[PDB]
Amino acid sequence: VRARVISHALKDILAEGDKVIIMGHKRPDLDAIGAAIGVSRFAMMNNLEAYIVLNETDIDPTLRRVMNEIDKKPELRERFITSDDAWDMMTSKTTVVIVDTHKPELVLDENVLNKANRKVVIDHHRRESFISNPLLIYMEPYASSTAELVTELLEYQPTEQRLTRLESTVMYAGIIVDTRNFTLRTGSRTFDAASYLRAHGADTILTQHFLKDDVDTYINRSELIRTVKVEDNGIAIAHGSDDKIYHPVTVAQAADELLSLEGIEASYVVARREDNLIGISARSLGSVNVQLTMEALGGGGHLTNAATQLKGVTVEEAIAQLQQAITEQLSR
Amino acid sequence: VRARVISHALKDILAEGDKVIIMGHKRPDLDAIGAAIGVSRFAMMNNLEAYIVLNETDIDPTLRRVMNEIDKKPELRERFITSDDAWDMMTSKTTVVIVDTHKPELVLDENVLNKANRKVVIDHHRRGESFISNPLLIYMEPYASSTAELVTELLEYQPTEQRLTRLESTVMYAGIIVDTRNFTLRTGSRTFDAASYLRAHGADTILTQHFLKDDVDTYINRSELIRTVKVEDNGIAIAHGSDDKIYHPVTVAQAADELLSLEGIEASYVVARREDNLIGISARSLGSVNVQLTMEALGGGGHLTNAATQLKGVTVEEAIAQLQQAITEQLSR
Ligand SMILES: Nc1nc2c(ncn2[C@@H]2O[C@@H]3COP(=O)(O)O[C@H]4[C@@H](O)[C@H](n5cnc6c(=O)[nH]c(N)nc65)O[C@@H]4COP(=O)(O)O[C@H]3[C@H]2O)c(=O)[nH]1
Ligand SMILES: Nc1nc2c(ncn2[C@@H]2O[C@@H]3COP(=O)(O)O[C@H]4[C@@H](O)[C@H](n5cnc6c(=O)[nH]c(N)nc65)O[C@@H]4COP(=O)(O)O[C@H]3[C@H]2O)c(=O)[nH]1
Ligand SMILES: [Mn+2]
Ligand SMILES: [Mn+2]
Ligand SMILES: [Mn+2]
């Protein structure tokens, strides 16, 4: 429906410009990069000239692995340009496309954004702040990702110049990342888009390769997990020893990983973050609402994803406050 | 369409028999069960009479978790019958459908098969020497992900008044997940089309996660093999269990497997006390390093990516040593 008209409607909004320039959000992830690459391709399909804005300093380790493939094995590189090159090349008929974000403060380059007279916003979140006077707004909160939304727009244009395998892989990876391998916000349309991409060469094992965790993170993550106590009621608590500082990501990951073990519906992981700060990551399948649990300990978030931080306490005191909160939350 | 043709042809063959009996392979997995279920929904969509064969001895831990949900929908629970119930109700007009196998000695009940007059076969394996005798229809597709994927396609072309239920599509979806290791093996656009169809009918991802939860204890175990690894610069990794401890062959195989999922690892070698006298080596590789050669050269063997060996007498630290030496060997040309 929307996806039907908006596709053709925007090859027109794009047909009316010298070039098209694409920007994601700062610290681009694979949804951002894949969505941009898609749109890149969507424009090329109408022989429109397209470039994606990326600076050396935006490219993190995960993205770095991607870009190495992009240099070693295609000609995808040459469509990536710096902020400067973007500015020094855009007129006022140049269409800027914003993918995977809607707040201007978050756009990869607010200057390249502000300069452009013709703005379009493709994002899959819900709407305060927002881009000024956009020629079009494709906001669809129920998609899994921006890469999904762009995938189903590709399916209307000149079938001629097809998605490369590699472009497909990266779009695919963005979907994998945002859905956690098809376990979150996945609808039939996610699978429709995954079908389309896989039809065009999307490599699942290369996708695995971009995403692989490292040894030390596994080891550190499992240190927390081997301490878990699971209650009959499905609540599970793991912890780090009070004398050891854990990186807050491996704590978040531990909490996630536990949701994949039998009998665990909600996970809480407690570990020293700083010299006088304890962190707790909470996670659930949706039966237990871990937002309430974190809010009652000074944190917050969403029903299945939440966290909090506590100062001055030892690991054991925070666990105590944690149990107090849980037993209070699930008294019946 | 081919599947449209097959769908419609199967409708005739099922309707002209007097009822349908559905049977997968021995120690059925979620795919065989998902597939059988889909076939029984297919039948119902044409007010045919369908039964799935399943004995209580034929239900592993995973499957029991699944039957636990099925018991809540009597309509669905009542479709499953035992080998006996099945034999005593077969006639000459009864049509038996084999799912997820094509090998007569792999069928769940050889007896029920042998009494079968009218037969159908749907599988995603490739033909071996043996084969179901004189089937009325054959829907094999060696490149598909699962029999659940194939059955799913056939479903798409039938009356939709009494649709595939939420619970039915969930089990079929689970079969696809097990067979493809969560869309990481032998997955194709058609696999995603099946998945989309299933998901459109309420296939529940959380419940599927439930069916497939790992054992806490076994996570921790596999964890302390992986915890031990040392990865050389060339991407060869070596993990070991203590020699005083003893590990399940599956814990070991899983550790070696799960090491490949880590960054910068081309090949894994896990080594742990397999008995009291014996030591075990599991070896895996992305596809580059030649774990076969390494293992063959230790009185073992397997395949380029998946090989292994056992060594009786030695103790781990020396088994590790024999590994280093054999590796150092094929490595330096
Ligand atoms: N009201 C309130 N809410 C809070 C507070 N602290 C955290 N939250 C909220 O609760 C969410 C829980 O994630 P986290 O456990 O703190 O843990 C962090 C972080 O450790 C985790 N994370 C970061 N990178 C990764 C990753 O590569 N993988 C995984 N599995 N998790 C990651 O996700 C979280 C960060 O993302 P967020 O979207 O911000 O998601 C946060 C955030 O929305 C707080 O003091 N007050
Ligand atoms: N020449 C020679 N070849 C050998 C020897 N041992 C194994 N092989 C061959 O190479 C494969 C290596 O797997 P494994 O590490 O020994 O590990 C074992 C076993 O631990 C593992 N396994 C057992 N259960 C499971 C399971 O539920 N899941 C998974 N992923 N693996 C399992 O699969 C392997 C056994 O099944 P196979 O299909 O036969 O797979 C074997 C077998 O084909 C040997 O001593 N000499
Ligand atoms: Mn993003
Ligand atoms: Mn996104
Ligand atoms: Mn199968």
GROMACS .gro file of N, CA, C and O in nm, chain B residues 5 9 42 61 65 68 75 84 89 101 125 186 188 194 196 200 208 210 222 225 256 262 269 325 327:
model
  100
  337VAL      N    1   0.084  -2.728  -0.892
  337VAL     CA    2   0.050  -2.855  -0.954
  337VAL      C    3   0.048  -2.965  -0.849
  337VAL      O    4  -0.049  -3.041  -0.839
  341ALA      N    5  -0.262  -3.187  -0.705
  341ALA     CA    6  -0.254  -3.330  -0.730
  341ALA      C    7  -0.267  -3.409  -0.599
  341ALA      O    8  -0.324  -3.518  -0.596
  374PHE      N    9  -0.360  -2.929   0.584
  374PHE     CA   10  -0.392  -2.947   0.443
  374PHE      C   11  -0.517  -3.033   0.424
  374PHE      O   12  -0.612  -2.995   0.355
  393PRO      N   13   1.296  -3.503   2.477
  393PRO     CA   14   1.281  -3.382   2.560
  393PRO      C   15   1.225  -3.261   2.484
  393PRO      O   16   1.131  -3.197   2.532
  397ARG      N   17   0.823  -3.084   2.523
  397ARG     CA   18   0.794  -2.942   2.540
  397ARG      C   19   0.688  -2.896   2.440
  397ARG      O   20   0.607  -2.807   2.469
  400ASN      N   21   0.343  -3.065   2.512
  400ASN     CA   22   0.289  -2.991   2.626
  400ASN      C   23   0.197  -2.875   2.587
  400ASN      O   24   0.097  -2.849   2.655
  407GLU      N   25  -0.855  -3.031   1.988
  407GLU     CA   26  -0.874  -3.052   1.845
  407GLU      C   27  -0.744  -3.105   1.786
  407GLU      O   28  -0.741  -3.208   1.718
  416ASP      N   29  -0.038  -4.864   1.686
  416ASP     CA   30  -0.151  -4.956   1.693
  416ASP      C   31  -0.279  -4.893   1.642
  416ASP      O   32  -0.346  -4.951   1.557
  421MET      N   33  -0.665  -4.909   1.186
  421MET     CA   34  -0.756  -4.826   1.108
  421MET      C   35  -0.718  -4.813   0.961
  421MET      O   36  -0.794  -4.756   0.882
  433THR      N   37   1.144  -3.795   0.518
  433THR     CA   38   1.229  -3.909   0.492
  433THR      C   39   1.182  -3.976   0.365
  433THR      O   40   1.070  -3.953   0.319
  457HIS      N   41   1.558  -3.416   0.134
  457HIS     CA   42   1.684  -3.489   0.118
  457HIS      C   43   1.702  -3.533  -0.027
  457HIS      O   44   1.609  -3.525  -0.108
  518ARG      N   45   2.137  -2.347   0.462
  518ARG     CA   46   2.046  -2.397   0.358
  518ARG      C   47   1.915  -2.321   0.355
  518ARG      O   48   1.809  -2.381   0.341
  520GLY      N   49   1.694  -2.013   0.175
  520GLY     CA   50   1.680  -1.952   0.044
  520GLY      C   51   1.559  -1.862   0.045
  520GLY      O   52   1.489  -1.855   0.144
  526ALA      N   53   0.816  -1.913   0.303
  526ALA     CA   54   0.750  -2.003   0.398
  526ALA      C   55   0.736  -1.935   0.535
  526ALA      O   56   0.626  -1.926   0.589
  528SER      N   57   0.744  -1.627   0.612
  528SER     CA   58   0.651  -1.515   0.605
  528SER      C   59   0.507  -1.564   0.609
  528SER      O   60   0.422  -1.510   0.681
  532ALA      N   61   0.263  -1.488   0.912
  532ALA     CA   62   0.137  -1.420   0.885
  532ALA      C   63   0.021  -1.492   0.954
  532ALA      O   64  -0.080  -1.428   0.987
  540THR      N   65   0.858  -2.051   2.016
  540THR     CA   66   0.962  -2.127   1.948
  540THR      C   67   1.094  -2.117   2.023
  540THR      O   68   1.165  -2.215   2.037
  542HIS      N   69   1.105  -2.087   2.336
  542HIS     CA   70   1.078  -2.177   2.448
  542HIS      C   71   1.112  -2.323   2.412
  542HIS      O   72   1.183  -2.390   2.487
  554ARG      N   73   2.989  -2.652   2.841
  554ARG     CA   74   3.047  -2.612   2.714
  554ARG      C   75   3.127  -2.484   2.737
  554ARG      O   76   3.228  -2.458   2.672
  557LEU      N   77   3.497  -2.525   2.842
  557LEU     CA   78   3.588  -2.572   2.738
  557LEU      C   79   3.630  -2.451   2.658
  557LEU      O   80   3.749  -2.428   2.634
  588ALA      N   81   3.357  -2.689   2.015
  588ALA     CA   82   3.432  -2.672   1.890
  588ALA      C   83   3.349  -2.591   1.791
  588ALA      O   84   3.400  -2.501   1.723
  594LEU      N   85   3.317  -1.731   1.709
  594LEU     CA   86   3.394  -1.623   1.767
  594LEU      C   87   3.487  -1.559   1.665
  594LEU      O   88   3.529  -1.624   1.568
  601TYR      N   89   3.996  -2.670   1.782
  601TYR     CA   90   4.033  -2.803   1.828
  601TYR      C   91   4.007  -2.812   1.976
  601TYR      O   92   4.081  -2.756   2.056
  657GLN      N   93   5.196  -3.071   1.721
  657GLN     CA   94   5.296  -3.126   1.631
  657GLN      C   95   5.240  -3.155   1.493
  657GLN      O   96   5.304  -3.126   1.392
  659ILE      N   97   4.971  -3.023   1.364
  659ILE     CA   98   4.935  -2.894   1.309
  659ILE      C   99   5.061  -2.824   1.257
  659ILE      O  100   5.067  -2.781   1.142
   0.00000   0.00000   0.00000
